Amino acid sequence: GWEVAVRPLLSASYSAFEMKELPQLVASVIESESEILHHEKQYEPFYSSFVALSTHYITTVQLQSVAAACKVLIEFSLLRLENPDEACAVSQKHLILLIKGLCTGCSRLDRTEIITFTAMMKSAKLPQTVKTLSELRQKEVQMNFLNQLTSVFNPRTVAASAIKTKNVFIAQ
């Protein structure tokens, strides 16, 4: 379900982002691609705040899956910047600075807005259930294996640890 998908962001809203919570978040973003971009009005703000929090958390810090998720979010923000509807929980300037942050060192969004994002998060109705917000290991390993097998990540063509990890992240 989507509730178990959004648990990690809700838990991390009161702390930092646990390293354990990233890969399943990435898997949730990839598996939801067929759904994230085509939607009705009532669910759109919930998706907007979800993507805002997810982007904020990824830019606060296996590379292939992260790159795929980041491309997913960048595309969704792009087509929100083209159309923008009235009922978008995140207005156009925050999409612009979020896109900048994903391409930079994450110094755009502030606490004062992500509190409102979490509040709307809770106040928003879920896609699969009318109720509002207010095994797996082998499967995820197999997707990671297939993702690595299909395509080869650079790595050294672009080119102490944090800096080159950050540089390859911006390159992707």
Binding site: Q138, N144, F145, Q148, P155
Partner: protein
């Protein structure tokens, strides 16, 4: 002082003085004819003509020094179109002069290689080579300075800089092709352009055989420097290209053209891919030969760096390109001989092993090129089969399967097989015949080795990663293939136990591996463990010690007898994780297959009961010592057989 200098209009006078030199005039004229006729002219001609062009080198040195000094003054700012044309003419003529002296020195070295003379190195030849190095370095310096001046000007912009780079790359690539097409003796002795060479190569039914012979005795430091500059220009042009079959881009600094037009002009001038791979192969061969002899020109790291750089250019600029036309060209221009050369390079690097940091960088580059070529769907399947066969690990080969595969060959082989399996499973194609054939051949070779009772060497049979990739390949099969393989395994076990008297004196090492594989099949016949995926990712698909689950007790004795904390080659390994040590749940589908037709369970149990005495007679008389390998082999085999006998129901 500079106010005084540009007040007198000294820039025009200095440029006019530099243009009409009595010695650069021939180079300027030749460059003009080359650009007019679209061809490329270099005339060192024969060895005698090379000497005639030589011996005047000091005048060329003093000329290039004075020209560089003149161009180092601020006399270039008002880049009018006429001034632009004059400046590019001068710079490109100087580059042509550097190319020509490099070709002359290469021809002289080839002619010296023709005749075996043991005379000591004289001072005159040393002066000549130093002069050649100085003139080529100064020519490159002049070219770079003029390019920087053109790029940063406020009257000549990006388009003129692009045309300048295109002209430089064209000259450099033509020079490299000519210098690498020098014959050792045949054309050099029978000679006593580039269009004539292309025509004569096309007319001949068979291409010039530049194979494993000693023909490529040219090359050198000058070739490496020229290739480095050419590759820099090429990567600049292709990076520009990345972001209707028209005419090739005009070779004028004032021409207007797109990046595709410039690249297509470069392709029209010379077939690029063959040239690039030829330089890669020649550079690696020279580096390896020099490294072998050892145990600028006396060091091998320069040629290895050039090879790594050209390979990295081929990877980043071409393989990963998004443009459709360049991908079409790459698909068209790949040849089987290139695959043979790549297989030779892979064999050389895996046999040689790790040597140094430059070797590490070259290995990383080769790994990346190999996997990028495999994954991104340009090579036709026949080319992949050619690469496999030249590697000696073709899935349809008739000989015995090589039980030891070197890491690079294993990586590429596993990558291709897993890609085939993934594509077939996603589409719905039944099981790929290649994997069935490889499993059958592996089992047949294993059976023959078990029958012969042969103990292989440490670098001979069945390293761990080979087995892991084989197991993962097995897991992807359908139920029919897996039950067929289990039935074949049962048949092997039943048949091989009939000659027990001969077995009693053999050393059961192949038997131990067979029993380990059977135990793994019995434990995980249906599903595939996570640690297998992690190991196959880390050991094979990750860029460049392996990770496995070897027997703690057996490896204890093996390391104790090995003593000096090395254990580089793991010979006693286990595939299943130690976590299953707790009472070891047999698979339901496994026993469902076991208690059915196509297998005869009673004689199967009898064979496993009888096989417990497969090494009883080894210790028995000749006063010969029992080495550590054999003792560990018997203990390993007995432990494996005891474990498997404790799981099968009676």
């Amino acid at each position: 002082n500079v106010a005084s200098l540009q007040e007198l209009g000294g820039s025009e006078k200095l440029l006019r003085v530099c243009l009409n030199l009595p010695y650069f005039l021939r180079y300027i004229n030749r460059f003009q004819d080359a650009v007019l006729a679209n061809s490329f002219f270099i005339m060192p001609a024969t060895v005698a003509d090379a000497t005639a062009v030589r011996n005047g080198f000091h005048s060329l040195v003093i000329d290039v020094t004075m020209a560089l000094d003149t161009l180092s003054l601020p006399v270039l700012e008002p880049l009018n179109p006429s001034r632009l044309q004059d400046v590019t003419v001068l710079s490109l003529s100087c580059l042509y002069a550097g190319v020509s002296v490099a070709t002359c020195m290469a021809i002289l070295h080839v002619g010296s290689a023709q005749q075996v003379r043991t005379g000591s190195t004289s001072s005159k030849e040393d002066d000549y080579e130093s002069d050649a190095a100085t003139i080529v370095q100064k020519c490159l310096e002049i070219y770079d300075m003029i390019g920087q001046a053109i790029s940063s000007s406020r009257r000549a912009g990006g388009e003129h800089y692009q045309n300048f780079q295109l002209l430089g790359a064209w000259c450099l690539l033509n020079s490299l092709f000519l210098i690498l097409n020098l014959s050792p003796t045949a054309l050099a002795d029978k000679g006593k352009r580039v269009r004539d060479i292309l025509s004569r190569t096309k007319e001949g039914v068979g291409s010039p055989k530049l194979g494993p012979g000693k023909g490529h005795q040219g090359f050198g430091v000058l070739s490496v420097i020229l290739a480095n500059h050419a590759i820099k220009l090429l990567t600049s042009l292709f990076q520009d290209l990345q972001v209707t079959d028209g005419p090739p881009a005009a070779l004028s600094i004032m021409a207007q053209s797109t990046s595709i037009q410039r690249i297509q002009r470069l392709i029209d001038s010379v077939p690029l891919m063959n040239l690039l791979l030829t330089l890669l192969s020649t550079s690696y061969r020279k580096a390896c030969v020099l490294q072998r002899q050892r145990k600028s020109r006396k060091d091998p790291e320069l040629f290895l760096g050039l090879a790594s750089n050209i390979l990295n250019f081929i990877t980043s600029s071409m393989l990963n390109s998004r443009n459709n036309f360049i991908r079409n060209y790459l698909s068209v221009s790949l040849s089987e001989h290139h695959m043979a050369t790549l297989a030779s390079i892979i064999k050389e690097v895996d046999k040689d092993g790790l040597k140094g940091s430059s070797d590490e960088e070259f290995a990383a580059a080769l790994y990346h090129f190999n996997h990028s070529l495999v994954t991104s769907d340009l090579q036709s399947p026949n080319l992949q089969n050619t690469l496999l066969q030249q590697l000696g690990v073709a899935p349809f080969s008739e000989g015995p399967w090589p039980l030891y595969i070197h890491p690079q060959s294993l990586s590429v082989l596993s990558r291709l097989l897993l890609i085939w399996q993934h594509k077939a499973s996603a589409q719905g194609d039944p099981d790929v015949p290649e994997c069935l054939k490889v499993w059958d051949r592996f089992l047949s070779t294993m059976k023959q080795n078990a029958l012969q009772g042969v103990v292989p060497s440490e670098t001979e049979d069945l390293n761990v990663e080979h087995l892991q990739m084989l197991l993962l390949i097995f897991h992807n099969f359908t139920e029919t293939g897996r039950r067929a393989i289990l039935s074949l395994f049962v048949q092997i076990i039943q048949e091989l136990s009939v000659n027990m008297d001969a077995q009693m004196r053999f050393v059961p090492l192949i038997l131990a591996r067979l029993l380990l594989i059977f135990d793994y099949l019995l434990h995980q016949y249906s599903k595939a463990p996570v640690y297998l995926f992690e190991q196959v990712q880390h050991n094979l698909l990750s860029p460049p010690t392996p990770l496995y689950h070897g027997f703690k007790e057996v490896e204890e004795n093996w390391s104790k007898h090995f003593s000096s904390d090395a254990v580089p080659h793991p010979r006693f390994y286990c595939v299943l994780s130690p976590e299953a040590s707790e009472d070891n749940r047999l698979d339901s589908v496994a026993c469902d297959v076991l208690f059915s037709k196509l297998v005869k369970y009673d004689e199967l149990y009898a064979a496993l009961t009888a096989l417990l005495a497969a090494g009883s007679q080894l210790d028995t008389k000749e006063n010969k010592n029992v080495t550590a390998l054999e003792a560990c082999a018997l203990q390993y085999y007995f432990l494996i057989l005891w474990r498997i006998l404790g799981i099968l129901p009676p």
